[PDB]
Design a protein around this ligand. Structure first.
Ligand SMILES: [Ca+2]
Length: 216
């Protein structure tokens, strides 16, 4: 059994693909995708967009246990990530693709989610990368919100206004779990897949991937 893609890569399995991981402090398993070829490898994907259209306006429960497929677009799960990220220090790497064929990334030295009781609040430290000098995810990390779980800092329900579950502020500078818009419909959409500090205002990205890995 493996705790994440890092241990998987370190056991000799150096090839990309879906792997079966096990929850820590539990016997439950979970199917995640391991990116072993992207620089160094050992990456555990926790979310992906590219479009295999999965529908991201999911419930609190669904974002907690995961939805979609590891082979395509998916969420992996908040309960698992929270358990992993509290067992040891993880790094978070977000890879983005726009519709003009450009790519970029944001990287955090340390990332972890608080337990469900604290609404899986995100914690971020030390940003680097080509996807902005200022974190597109509001610092002083927010709680996680879903259509049926409003934990943002807005008098409004950010989740329903922009669609998707996310660490919304007063609907901060980003939402990787927003409505997918195809080419030639990806501009001027407060509704799309946004990472403000890279493409800007109403730009809706073509593909996104969130992955974690420890300091290996
Ligand atoms: Ca609110």
């Amino acid at each position: 059994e493996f705790r994440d893609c890092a241990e998987v890569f370190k056991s000799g399995h150096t090839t990309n693909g879906i792997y079966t991981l096990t929850f820590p402090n539990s016997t439950e398993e979970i199917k995640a995708y391991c990116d072993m070829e992207a620089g160094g490898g050992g990456w555990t994907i926790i979310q992906r967009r590219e479009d295999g259209s999965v529908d991201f306006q999911r419930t609190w429960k669904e974002y907690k246990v995961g939805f979609g497929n590891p082979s395509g677009e998916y969420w992996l799960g908040n309960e698992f990530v929270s358990q992993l990220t509290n067992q040891q220090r993880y790094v978070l790497k977000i890879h983005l693709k726009d519709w003009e064929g450009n790519e970029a990334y944001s990287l955090y030295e340390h990332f972890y989610l608080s337990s469900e009781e604290l609404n899986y609040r995100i914690h971020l430290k030390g940003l680097t990368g080509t996807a902005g000098k200022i974190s597109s995810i509001s610092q002083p990390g927010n709680d996680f919100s879903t259509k049926d779980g409003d934990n943002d800092k807005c008098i409004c329900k950010c989740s329903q206004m922009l669609t998707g579950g996310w660490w919304f502020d007063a609907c901060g500078p980003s939402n990787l779990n927003g409505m997918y818009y195809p080419q030639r419909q990806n501009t001027n959409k407060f509704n799309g897949i946004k990472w403000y500090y890279w493409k800007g205002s109403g730009y809706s990205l073509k593909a996104t991937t969130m992955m974690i890995r420890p300091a290996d």
